Amino acid sequence: ASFLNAVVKVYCTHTAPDYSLPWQKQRQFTSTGSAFMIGDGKLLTNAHCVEHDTQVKVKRRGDDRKYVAKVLVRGVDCDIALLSVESEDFWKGAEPLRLGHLPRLQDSVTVVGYPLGGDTISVTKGVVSRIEVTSYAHGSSDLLGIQIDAAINPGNSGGPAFNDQGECIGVAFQVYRSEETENIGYVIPTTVVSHFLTDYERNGKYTGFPVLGIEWQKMENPDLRKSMGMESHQKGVRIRRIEPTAPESQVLKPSDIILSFDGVNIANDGTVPFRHGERIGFSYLISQKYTGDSALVKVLRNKEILEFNIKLAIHKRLIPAHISGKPPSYFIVAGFVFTTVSVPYLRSEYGKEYEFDAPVKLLEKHLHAMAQSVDEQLVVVSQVLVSDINIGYEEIVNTQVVAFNGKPVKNLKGLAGMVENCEDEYMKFNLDYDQIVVLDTKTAKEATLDILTTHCIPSAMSDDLK
Amino acid sequence: ASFLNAVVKVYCTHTAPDYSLPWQKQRQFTSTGSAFMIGDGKLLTNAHCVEHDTQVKVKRRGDDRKYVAKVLVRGVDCDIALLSVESEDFWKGAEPLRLGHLPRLQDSVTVVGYPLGGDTISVTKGVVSRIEVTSYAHGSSDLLGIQIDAAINPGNSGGPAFNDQGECIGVAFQVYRSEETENIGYVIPTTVVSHFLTDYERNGKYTGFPVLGIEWQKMENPDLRKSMGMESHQKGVRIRRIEPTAPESQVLKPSDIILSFDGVNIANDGTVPFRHGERIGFSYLISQKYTGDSALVKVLRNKEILEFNIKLAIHKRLIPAHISGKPPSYFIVAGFVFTTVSVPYLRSEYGKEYEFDAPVKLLEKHLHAMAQSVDEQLVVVSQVLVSDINIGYEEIVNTQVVAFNGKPVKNLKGLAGMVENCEDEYMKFNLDYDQIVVLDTKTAKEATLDILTTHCIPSAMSDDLK
Amino acid sequence: ASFLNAVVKVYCTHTAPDYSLPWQKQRQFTSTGSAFMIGDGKLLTNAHCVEHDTQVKVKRRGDDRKYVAKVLVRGVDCDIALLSVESEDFWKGAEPLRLGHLPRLQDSVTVVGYPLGGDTISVTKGVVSRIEVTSYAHGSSDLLGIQIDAAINPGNSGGPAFNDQGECIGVAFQVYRSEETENIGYVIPTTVVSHFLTDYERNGKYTGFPVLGIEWQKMENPDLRKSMGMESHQKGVRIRRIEPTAPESQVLKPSDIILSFDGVNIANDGTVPFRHGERIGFSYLISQKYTGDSALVKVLRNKEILEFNIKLAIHKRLIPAHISGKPPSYFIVAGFVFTTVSVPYLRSEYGKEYEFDAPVKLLEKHLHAMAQSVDEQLVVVSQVLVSDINIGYEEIVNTQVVAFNGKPVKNLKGLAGMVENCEDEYMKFNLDYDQIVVLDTKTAKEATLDILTTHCIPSAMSDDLK
Amino acid sequence: FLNAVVKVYCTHTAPDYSLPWQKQRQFTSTGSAFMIGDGKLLTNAHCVEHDTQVKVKRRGDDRKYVAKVLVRGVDCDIALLSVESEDFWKGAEPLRLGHLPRLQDSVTVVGYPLGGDTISVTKGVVSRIEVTSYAHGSSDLLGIQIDAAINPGNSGGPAFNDQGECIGVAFQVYRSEETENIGYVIPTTVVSHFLTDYERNGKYTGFPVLGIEWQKMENPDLRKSMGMESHQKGVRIRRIEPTAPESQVLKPSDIILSFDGVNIANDGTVPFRHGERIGFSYLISQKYTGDSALVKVLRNKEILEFNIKLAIHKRLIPAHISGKPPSYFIVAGFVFTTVSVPYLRSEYGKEYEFDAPVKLLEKHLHAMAQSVDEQLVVVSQVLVSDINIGYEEIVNTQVVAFNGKPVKNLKGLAGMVENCEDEYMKFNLDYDQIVVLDTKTAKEATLDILTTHCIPSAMSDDL
C-alpha cells in the first residue's frame, strides 16, 4: 500500500487565451487531475491537466496542505508533463515509482488516482485489453497505446497504472465513451514515457516524436501491385504525397513503394510484425526513434530497389493542432485584425463542431494542405474593428490573405513587416475569393490607436511582432 | 496465449432486400465482428454478423490478408452461424478451441474478440453473473443464456468467452444497455452451441429449437387452484390457448393444468428446479430437446390425471420474426403490390418504432394471432403503383386481403394462383375494414407491364411465384 | 455458494401520499430490490426499497413462493430497514451472513442481488475503490461510504457486498451515474450497519446518527489564522453559525476555532487522520457516536483555549428531507389548504427540478434557514379551494403564513389551534410578501364542509390535528 | 374568381440518386393550379416534380381528371398543365394577368392549403418587391413578398389584385420560430417571360445571368487606387466564367460602369421603380437567352464598351437534374456518377452543406466549369467483388484522370473505359490515390455484380 503514497492530487487553475480576441484572456476555470513521483524531485502528469496554467497545486496523501507546483516541461503531442515542487515538506519521505516493461494482454492492471465521486484516492482494477498504435486525442498524434478494462473516470488523468508487481506500466490518460461502449480506457505506455524522459534528459528540452512526412496508400489489390512492377513476393505501401518540409522529400518520390523501414518489411496494409504473433502499424517503428535519428528506407522505383538513409523530424502542420507556451500572434492595422489559423482558433470561432461549421476553404486546408515552407502560416483577417477608415470592408471575416502589394504572404511576421515597411500610397491586400482590400497607407496607420481604445485593446500586436 | 490465435476478425458486406420495395435491394453496408475455430475447418460466429451477406472475409492474428469466407449454415433464432474458408493458407497451423461445461456463478470469464476502440484483438475479464432463460434479441427466441460482467462492446459479437482453463464456455453475442445499467452482457452457452452443432451434424442442416405451442397462465392464487379441482399438494400452470398448427393441439386442451414435463414438476409460477438450488423457466426443458423428439406431458383435466407423449416442433409465427435465405415474396397485378407481413416488413414500413406506429390491425395480429394452418400468411396490398387502371384505389396501403372472388386467402402463393387462373369478368378483392376492390380481369392484367417500366421494376413477381 | 441462499428478492408495492393533495394517495406502483439474512429472524434491506409500503414480499432462492414481509424498523437517513417474515417455511434452513470489518482499498469484493437483466440472482465482482464520508442520496445525510468498481445496477439495492472470505462488508445501495462515468458504486459499510443494529438493540427503536449543529469555514489562509490569534502551530476550523436547537449553542460561539474533537486534532481543511495514512472529514468522528453520547470539544476563543463536553443529537431541518411513518399534515378552513413545507412537498409541487423552479422565498429557507425552536415548521397556504367565501384570494399558492391575529405562527398545530379557538369577528392571516388575508370568522368555518364535498375530500384535517 | 383555381394531386416517383439505377418509393402531394387560357393550367414546377401521375379537380365537380405536364421551368419554378377531358373545361373562364403591383396594394391568395379539402382564400397586402432567391429552383429572380398567409398546398395558386387580375403565383415562404406572414409570389413579369419564351421557342430556354462574380466599390481608397474619378461608380469584376462569352472580352479587375446605358452604383444596384433601386441582375434577367447587352467597363483609365451575348448559368455541380434520370455507369462494381446538389442531399442528408466531404463542398461553393459540359465525376461506391479487392472503402471520391488523360465528364470517362485497349485501367482519384484494374478481367466481372444487386443495366440510357 506504500505505492499509493506516490500518487498525488493535481489542482489547476487555467486561463486560456481568447483565440477570437487574441489581445485578452478567457475566464479563469479550474480542473483537477492526478500525478505521481518518478524520482529526482519530479512528478509526472498529463499535459492536458495543466494546459494554460496560471496556477498548479498538488496534495499528497495524509497531508492536508496543497503545495504550489510548477510545470518543468511539457510534451503536448504525447500528453505528458513533468512538475517540480519547491516545498521540502512535500518531498519528505518520498518513494518514487519504478517503470515496468510493456505488459501482455490479460495482465492484471490497477489504476490509481483522483476521479469524480469523492475527494480521496481511488483504485480500480481490470486487465490489459489491447495494445496498438493509438490516437492521442488531446495530443493529436499517433503513438503506442495500452487499452485496459479497469474503469478510468474524469480526474484519473495523469495517475499511474500498475502491474501486479507494483511497477508503473503507464499513465491513465483518455477514454472512448459512447452510449454503446463500456470500459474502453487508455494508458500511455512506459515505452512512450521513457522516450519522453530520455528525450528531456538528453536535450534539456522536449524534442518530440518523429513521424515521416509521407501520405501512403495500401497495395492490397494484385492488379495494382502487378501494374507497378511488383513481383509476387514483394509487399508494401505506395507513396501518395510527401511533405515539402521533410528531408525525405529530397530522396523519396510519389508512387515509390516502401518495402521496408530499418530492415523491417512492411505489408500491403501498412503493418509490420509486433511482439508475439501480432501486427502493428509501421508508424510505431518511426515514433520509437528520436528526432535527429536516421532510418534506412528501402523502396521500389521503376522496378529498381533503392535504399536511403533519412533523418527523422517532427511533423509540422500548416494549421497547428496546438499552440503552446505562447499567446496567439496577431497584429492590427486600421481595425483589421490579422491572425493565423490554428485548430484552437477554429474551435473558438466555430465551437466544438468546427470540423463541419467552419468555412470550407479553411477546412480544406486543415485536412489536406501541406506547408510549402517551414514557418509558413495560414494568415486571415479575423474580423474588422469597424471604423470610418475601413468603410465597405466591415463584413470581412476569416478570409485568407494571399498577397500584399503584389508580394505573396508566407506568414504573419512576414505580413506584419510588409505593412510596416510599406511606403507606397496604398496597401493592397489580395484576399481569398478573389477579393481586394485597399487602404490609403498614411491614414490607415493613423486610425489604429482610436480603434484600440474603443475595444479596450492594450496593444496593436502581440509581443513576438514587436 | 495460443488461445488468442483461434479468434479471427469478421468483415461483412451486407445487402438487405428492401421489404418496402421487394423487387430491389437496399444500399450496401459493412459491419465487423468476431469468430473462432471450433474444428474440422469450421469457424463459429453470430448469425447477426453475416445477415444478408454479399461478402464475408476473415483475418487471423499475425496475418495481414483478409480471406474470403462462406456461410455454411445459420441458426437465426439461436443467433449462430458456421463459416467455411477455402484458402489453405488461412488454416495453416490452426488450433481449434474446445468447448467447456456450463460454468457456475462467480466463475472467472474472459471475452476475446474485435470490438470498437482499435483494430487488433482485445481481451476483457470479469465473472459469470447470472444464468437463466434469456431473450435472444436478434433471434427473437427464449433460450438458456449466461450473463457476465466482463465488458462486451460492438464488434465482440461472435467471439468466445473462456473459463480460466482456456475452454470456451460460449459465444459473446448481446448486451443490455441503458443509461441506468452497467456490465450486463450475455453469452450463448456451450449447451446451446452443442445443440446447434449436434443438430447440424445429424441432419445436414439446422432444424431449430423446439418450443411447445402453448400459452399459459400462472396458478399462484389458491382460490383459482381450488376452483379447478387441484389438491393442496398439486402445483402447475393453466393452458390458455394452443397453437392449431402444433401436434399437442390434438391432445391437450385449454384450462388443462400442466403438472409435469418429462417427469419434472412445474411450479405454480412456471419454474422447475435447476442445478444447485435454483429455479428456471420450464421452457428450458423443451428447448434442450431436438425437433422430432417426444416429451411426456402430464396434465390435470377435470380432476383426472392424464399423460400424453407429444412430438416437439419449432414455433411458426403468422408474422415471422425473420425471413432468411430468400428474398421477400411479392406479386403485382394492375399496379397493386401484394406481399406478406413480417417483422422486417413492419420495421421497414414504420421504422424501429414499428410496435407503436404500425396499423393497430396489423399489430394486433403480430402480438396475438395464431396461424390456423401451416403456410398461412398475412397478405396485404403494400401499395398501389398509381395508373389509370387503378383509379379510386390509390390510397390503399398495408391493408389485409381476406378473400378473392368469394374464396378465402390463405397465403401469397394461394392468392397469386387465384388471380392467375381467374376467368371471371371481375377480380373482387375483399379487404380489411370492410372494403372491396374490383377490377376488370382482362384490362387489369394488360396494364401491369407499363407500370413496372415506370418504376423500373424488372419483374411482376418474386421467383418463388414463377 | 451457500452464501447466495441468504440473499432474497424484495417485491414492494408503494402507495405514496399526494403531498400536493394531502388528503389522498398517489397511484400504486411496484419496485423490486434485494435483502439478506443477518440473524434472529431479520432481513436487512435499504429503506428506499420499502418507502411508503402497502405490501412487501420476499422470495428465497430455490423456492417459487413470495412470502409476505413486514417492515420492523427503518433508518431513513442511513437508508437501512429491517424486515420480519412470519412464515416458518421461509426461515427453514436459514444461514445468516456474518458482518466483516471495514475493508482496505483494492480488496476484492463481490456484489450479490437481483438487478435488471433477469429474474434470478446475479453476482458481480470488482475491488474496493475508495472509502470516505459519502453523501447518502436517498437518506440526505453524510456518513462513511465504500466506493467499489463492481457493477451495481437497479435492483441490487439492499443486497450484500462480500469480501473474499464470504463476510458481508456492507450493503449495495447507490451509484454515481453520468455519461462521463463508469463503475462508481457505493456500499453502506458494516460500521454503519453495526451502528444501526446496535442502536435498534439498545433502544428498541432507531435514534439516528448524531451530527453537531454547526456550520464551519476552512482556515487555510495564514492572514486569516493570524488575525484571529492562532499560533503558527495551531490548526482548525472557524464556526460560522450554530443551530439554535442544538445544545452546543449554549456553549460554543460563532468565530470560535474548533481545534479538536475527542482529542483528535482537526486540520485547517476540516479533516482528521483516518486509518493508514489517509485523512477524512471530521464529521466521521461524530456520526460514529450515538445520540445521547457526549463529546469533548476544544476551541480557541479570543486566544483562550476552552473545552466543553457536549451532548450529541440528530439534526432537525426546518424543511425536512423526509417525512416518514406518517401522512403529511394539513388542515382546511374556508377552502384554504394549510400544510407544511418539506422536500417531498417541494418535489411534488415543482417536480424533480424543485431546486430551481420553486419560489425563491421557499428555496431560500430550504438551503439556508435554521429552525429557531424545536417543532418549528414552515407553514404555507398550499392552495385555495375556490368558493364564494374566499373571493379575491383565489390565486394564493405556496405562500408562508407568518402570523394569525397578531400572533406569530410557529407550526401547523399551533395555527390549527389558533383558528379553532378564534373568537374574534375576523381571522387575520399575515402572509409573505406583506399580504394580509382576512375572513369573517363565523362564515369562514360554515363554508368548509361544502368545499370538501366538491373536491371529494373526506376530512378537513389530518388525524394528528384531530 | 374561384372556379378558375383548381386543386392539384400529384404522385411523385423520384430517382434514387444514391442508387441511380432505381427509383425511390412513391409519394403523394397536393397543390394548386389556375386557368390561364387556351386549355392551359399554370402551377409551380415543384408541385409536379418527378411526376408519375397528375390529377386536377375543379370546384363543384367531384371528378379528379388526369392532367399532363406540357412544359416546366425548374429554376423559375413554373409548370404548365394540359387536361384532355372536355368535361373538366365546362364553362371555364380563365384568369387575366395584371401588372406588377405596388407596396401596400391589397392582395388575395386563392388555393388549396392544409386545414381542409376545399378552396381557401387569404387576404393581405403587397409587402416588398425585390430580387429573391427561388428556393426550389435555386436562382435569383424578381419576387413579390406579401403578408396574406401562404400555407402548404397554396403552391401554384394565384395571387389577385382587387380588380381580380392575377399578380402572380404563390410559391414559397420564409418560416422560422421568429417570423410571421413572410410569403412570396412569382410576379407576372416572370410568368410572362416564361410564357413568351415557351411561345417563341416551343420550349423553355431559361433566364439569362452573366457569368461574372463582382465586388462592391463602396471604399474611396479602393476606387481612387483603381483610377476612378470622384463622380464614377460601379462594381469590380472578381472572376469570370470561362464558359461565358464575356470571358473573351471582359477581364478581372475591370470596373463595370453600366449595363445597356444604365449606370450601376458602387453596391451593384440600378434604378428600379417608384424611388427604389434593384440589383443589376434584374436588368439581365428580364432579357431572353440569345439577346445581347452593352457593357461599359473601366480598365486602366480607359473606358471600353462590348456587346455581350447572354446565356443561362450552368453550375459545375447542378442544383437540379431535370428531363432525365441521373447518369451513371458501372465497371467491375465501381459505380461512377456525377456530383449534383440532389446527389449530395441524398448522400449526406438535409445537412449536406456541413456533412459532405470538404473537397466536394469546396467545388460546390466556389469552382467554375473550365469547359462546356464539364462535370464532377466520382466513384459513388464500390459494389464489393473479388475483382475490386482492396478498393471497397472508396466512397464519393473525384475521378481526375484515366490512363493519363484528364476526365472532363461522365460520358467522356465512359467512352475512355469502353475504348480502352491498354492492359490496365488506371484511375487517378482525389487525395493522390490510384485505382488500377486489369482491363480484360474488369469488364468480364461486371454482369454478375449487377445480378447480385438487382441492377437491370450497367449504365444509364444517355450514355
mmCIF file of N, CA and C in Angstrom, chain A residues 241-266:
data_model
loop_
_atom_site.group_PDB
_atom_site.id
_atom_site.type_symbol
_atom_site.label_atom_id
_atom_site.label_comp_id
_atom_site.label_asym_id
_atom_site.label_seq_id
_atom_site.Cartn_x
_atom_site.Cartn_y
_atom_site.Cartn_z
ATOM 1 N N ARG A 241 2.125 11.155 -51.471
ATOM 2 C CA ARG A 241 2.469 12.559 -51.382
ATOM 3 C C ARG A 241 3.515 12.722 -50.285
ATOM 4 N N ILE A 242 4.439 13.661 -50.465
ATOM 5 C CA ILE A 242 5.488 13.886 -49.476
ATOM 6 C C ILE A 242 5.509 15.340 -49.011
ATOM 7 N N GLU A 243 5.598 15.542 -47.699
ATOM 8 C CA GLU A 243 5.727 16.882 -47.127
ATOM 9 C C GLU A 243 6.953 17.594 -47.691
ATOM 10 N N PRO A 244 6.744 18.747 -48.337
ATOM 11 C CA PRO A 244 7.858 19.529 -48.887
ATOM 12 C C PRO A 244 8.885 19.926 -47.825
ATOM 13 N N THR A 245 8.451 20.034 -46.573
ATOM 14 C CA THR A 245 9.335 20.457 -45.492
ATOM 15 C C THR A 245 9.957 19.281 -44.736
ATOM 16 N N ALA A 246 9.908 18.094 -45.332
ATOM 17 C CA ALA A 246 10.551 16.926 -44.742
ATOM 18 C C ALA A 246 11.744 16.518 -45.602
ATOM 19 N N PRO A 247 12.846 16.097 -44.960
ATOM 20 C CA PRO A 247 14.072 15.742 -45.693
ATOM 21 C C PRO A 247 13.955 14.495 -46.574
ATOM 22 N N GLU A 248 12.900 13.701 -46.412
ATOM 23 C CA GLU A 248 12.695 12.567 -47.308
ATOM 24 C C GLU A 248 12.106 13.006 -48.642
ATOM 25 N N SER A 249 11.686 14.267 -48.725
ATOM 26 C CA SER A 249 11.181 14.810 -49.983
ATOM 27 C C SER A 249 12.321 14.981 -50.974
ATOM 28 N N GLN A 250 13.539 15.049 -50.449
ATOM 29 C CA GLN A 250 14.724 15.210 -51.280
ATOM 30 C C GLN A 250 15.179 13.890 -51.899
ATOM 31 N N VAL A 251 14.668 12.767 -51.395
ATOM 32 C CA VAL A 251 15.115 11.464 -51.896
ATOM 33 C C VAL A 251 13.999 10.482 -52.268
ATOM 34 N N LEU A 252 12.852 10.576 -51.599
ATOM 35 C CA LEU A 252 11.714 9.724 -51.938
ATOM 36 C C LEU A 252 10.841 10.407 -52.993
ATOM 37 N N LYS A 253 10.088 9.613 -53.752
ATOM 38 C CA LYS A 253 9.188 10.143 -54.775
ATOM 39 C C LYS A 253 7.774 9.584 -54.649
ATOM 40 N N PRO A 254 6.770 10.357 -55.084
ATOM 41 C CA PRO A 254 5.417 9.795 -55.165
ATOM 42 C C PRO A 254 5.403 8.554 -56.053
ATOM 43 N N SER A 255 4.567 7.582 -55.690
ATOM 44 C CA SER A 255 4.446 6.292 -56.376
ATOM 45 C C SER A 255 5.592 5.310 -56.110
ATOM 46 N N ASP A 256 6.591 5.730 -55.340
ATOM 47 C CA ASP A 256 7.540 4.783 -54.770
ATOM 48 C C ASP A 256 6.758 3.779 -53.937
ATOM 49 N N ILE A 257 7.213 2.536 -53.906
ATOM 50 C CA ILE A 257 6.619 1.563 -52.999
ATOM 51 C C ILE A 257 7.583 1.312 -51.851
ATOM 52 N N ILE A 258 7.167 1.653 -50.633
ATOM 53 C CA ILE A 258 8.020 1.431 -49.473
ATOM 54 C C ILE A 258 7.983 -0.043 -49.095
ATOM 55 N N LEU A 259 9.143 -0.691 -49.154
ATOM 56 C CA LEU A 259 9.243 -2.122 -48.897
ATOM 57 C C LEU A 259 9.650 -2.405 -47.454
ATOM 58 N N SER A 260 10.490 -1.546 -46.888
ATOM 59 C CA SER A 260 10.964 -1.774 -45.533
ATOM 60 C C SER A 260 11.454 -0.506 -44.849
ATOM 61 N N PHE A 261 11.521 -0.581 -43.527
ATOM 62 C CA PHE A 261 11.982 0.512 -42.697
ATOM 63 C C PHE A 261 12.883 -0.103 -41.634
ATOM 64 N N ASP A 262 14.148 0.315 -41.616
ATOM 65 C CA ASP A 262 15.169 -0.304 -40.771
ATOM 66 C C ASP A 262 15.164 -1.823 -40.871
ATOM 67 N N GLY A 263 15.065 -2.329 -42.095
ATOM 68 C CA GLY A 263 15.124 -3.756 -42.343
ATOM 69 C C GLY A 263 13.872 -4.515 -41.952
ATOM 70 N N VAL A 264 12.828 -3.798 -41.550
ATOM 71 C CA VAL A 264 11.577 -4.458 -41.207
ATOM 72 C C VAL A 264 10.598 -4.334 -42.370
ATOM 73 N N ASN A 265 10.115 -5.467 -42.871
ATOM 74 C CA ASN A 265 9.262 -5.457 -44.057
ATOM 75 C C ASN A 265 7.842 -4.981 -43.762
ATOM 76 N N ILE A 266 7.356 -4.063 -44.591
ATOM 77 C CA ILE A 266 6.015 -3.504 -44.444
ATOM 78 C C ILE A 266 5.023 -4.242 -45.343
#
